[PDB]
RNA sequence: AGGGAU
């Protein structure tokens, strides 16, 4: 008995976010952050987040990440929305993989 | 369910 797996949802740069009201969604996250593309939305709190409502984002290289880093603890409608950088120009990978790199890549 | 903030 054996198996195999891959990765396609962590291979990139990222940032964290909160303050997102328990009554709003990603359709306004990637629309208040910056004029950037929607390549950058997710929503989570936990299997115990009462109803969930916080978020996290990802970016195409550190260049797009800093191009969105301009609202540390800004606003959106009625709460002080916040987001905190979690990327650098050299951390696209460093602790995981997505292929056996021995016979399939 | 609220701020945790840097």
Short mmCIF file of C-alpha atoms (C1' of nucleotides) in Angstrom, two decimals:
data_model
loop_
_atom_site.label_atom_id
_atom_site.label_comp_id
_atom_site.label_asym_id
_atom_site.label_seq_id
_atom_site.Cartn_x
_atom_site.Cartn_y
_atom_site.Cartn_z
CA UNK A 1 0.00 0.00 0.00
CA UNK A 2 1.29 3.45 -1.02
CA UNK A 3 0.17 6.94 -2.10
CA UNK A 4 1.42 10.27 -3.50
CA UNK A 5 0.54 13.95 -3.06
CA UNK A 6 1.34 17.43 -4.44
CA UNK A 7 0.99 21.13 -3.54
CA UNK A 8 -0.63 24.01 -5.47
CA UNK A 9 -2.03 26.27 -2.71
CA UNK A 10 1.11 27.30 -0.76
CA UNK A 11 3.63 27.78 -3.62
CA UNK A 12 3.81 31.56 -3.37
CA UNK A 13 4.15 34.76 -1.33
CA UNK A 14 1.54 35.73 1.29
CA UNK A 15 0.09 38.17 3.84
CA UNK A 16 -2.42 37.83 6.71
CA UNK A 17 -5.64 39.83 7.25
CA UNK A 18 -8.31 40.47 9.90
CA UNK A 19 -10.96 43.02 10.89
CA UNK A 20 -13.00 41.75 7.94
CA UNK A 21 -16.57 42.02 9.33
CA UNK A 22 -18.41 38.79 10.18
CA UNK A 23 -20.83 39.90 7.39
CA UNK A 24 -18.55 40.54 4.37
CA UNK A 25 -16.37 38.56 1.91
CA UNK A 26 -13.41 38.32 -0.46
CA UNK A 27 -15.32 40.22 -3.16
CA UNK A 28 -14.37 43.34 -1.16
CA UNK A 29 -10.96 42.18 0.10
CA UNK A 30 -9.26 42.17 -3.31
CA UNK A 31 -11.23 45.37 -4.00
CA UNK A 32 -9.99 47.52 -1.06
CA UNK A 33 -6.41 46.21 -0.80
CA UNK A 34 -5.18 47.74 -4.10
CA UNK A 35 -6.13 47.72 -7.84
CA UNK A 36 -4.40 44.29 -8.03
CA UNK A 37 -5.97 41.11 -9.42
CA UNK A 38 -8.12 38.63 -7.40
CA UNK A 39 -5.21 36.11 -7.36
CA UNK A 40 -5.18 36.73 -3.61
CA UNK A 41 -8.21 35.72 -1.50
CA UNK A 42 -9.17 33.10 1.10
CA UNK A 43 -11.28 33.07 4.30
CA UNK A 44 -10.76 31.18 7.58
CA UNK A 45 -10.90 31.14 11.40
CA UNK A 46 -11.19 27.42 12.23
CA UNK A 47 -13.58 24.46 12.56
CA UNK A 48 -14.60 26.36 15.73
CA UNK A 49 -14.54 29.97 14.42
CA UNK A 50 -18.22 30.26 15.51
CA UNK A 51 -19.23 31.31 11.95
CA UNK A 52 -15.77 32.17 10.50
CA UNK A 53 -14.96 35.61 9.04
CA UNK A 54 -11.20 36.40 9.02
CA UNK A 55 -9.01 36.06 5.93
CA UNK A 56 -5.61 35.56 4.36
CA UNK A 57 -4.13 36.41 0.97
CA UNK A 58 -1.34 35.38 -1.41
CA UNK A 59 0.61 37.23 -4.11
CA UNK A 60 2.60 36.84 -7.31
CA UNK A 61 6.15 37.43 -5.99
CA UNK A 62 7.23 39.89 -3.30
CA UNK A 63 6.77 42.68 -5.87
CA UNK A 64 2.98 42.27 -5.95
CA UNK A 65 3.02 41.71 -2.17
CA UNK A 66 4.57 45.13 -1.42
CA UNK A 67 2.32 46.62 -4.14
CA UNK A 68 -0.55 45.67 -1.79
CA UNK A 69 1.24 46.61 1.47
CA UNK A 70 -0.29 50.08 1.99
CA UNK A 71 -3.19 49.60 4.47
CA UNK A 72 -1.56 48.02 7.58
CA UNK A 73 -4.60 48.82 9.77
CA UNK A 74 -6.77 50.98 7.46
CA UNK A 75 -10.59 50.91 6.97
CA UNK A 76 -13.16 49.49 4.50
CA UNK A 77 -16.67 50.25 5.82
CA UNK A 78 -17.07 50.23 9.61
CA UNK A 79 -14.08 48.39 11.20
CA UNK A 80 -10.35 49.10 11.25
CA UNK A 81 -9.45 46.35 8.76
CA UNK A 82 -5.87 45.11 9.05
CA UNK A 83 -3.29 43.07 7.14
CA UNK A 84 0.31 42.21 8.06
CA UNK A 85 3.11 41.31 5.60
CA UNK A 86 4.23 37.64 5.43
CA UNK A 87 6.53 37.61 2.38
CA UNK A 88 10.04 38.46 1.18
CA UNK A 89 12.01 38.48 -2.11
CA UNK A 90 13.39 35.00 -1.27
CA UNK A 91 10.71 32.83 0.41
CA UNK A 92 8.56 31.51 -2.46
CA UNK A 93 9.68 28.09 -1.14
CA UNK A 94 12.00 26.70 1.57
CA UNK A 95 10.27 24.04 3.72
CA UNK A 96 8.13 21.92 1.35
CA UNK A 97 7.85 20.45 -2.17
CA UNK A 98 5.25 19.44 -4.79
CA UNK A 99 6.95 16.54 -6.63
CA UNK A 100 9.07 13.45 -5.82
CA UNK A 101 11.84 15.13 -7.85
CA UNK A 102 13.34 11.67 -8.57
CA UNK A 103 11.23 10.25 -11.45
CA UNK A 104 8.37 12.68 -12.23
CA UNK A 105 10.14 16.08 -12.29
"C1'" A B 1 -17.36 39.24 17.99
"C1'" G B 2 -13.72 42.09 17.68
"C1'" G B 3 -8.83 44.16 17.73
"C1'" G B 4 -5.01 41.62 17.83
"C1'" A B 5 -1.49 46.15 15.70
"C1'" U B 6 3.54 46.69 14.76
#
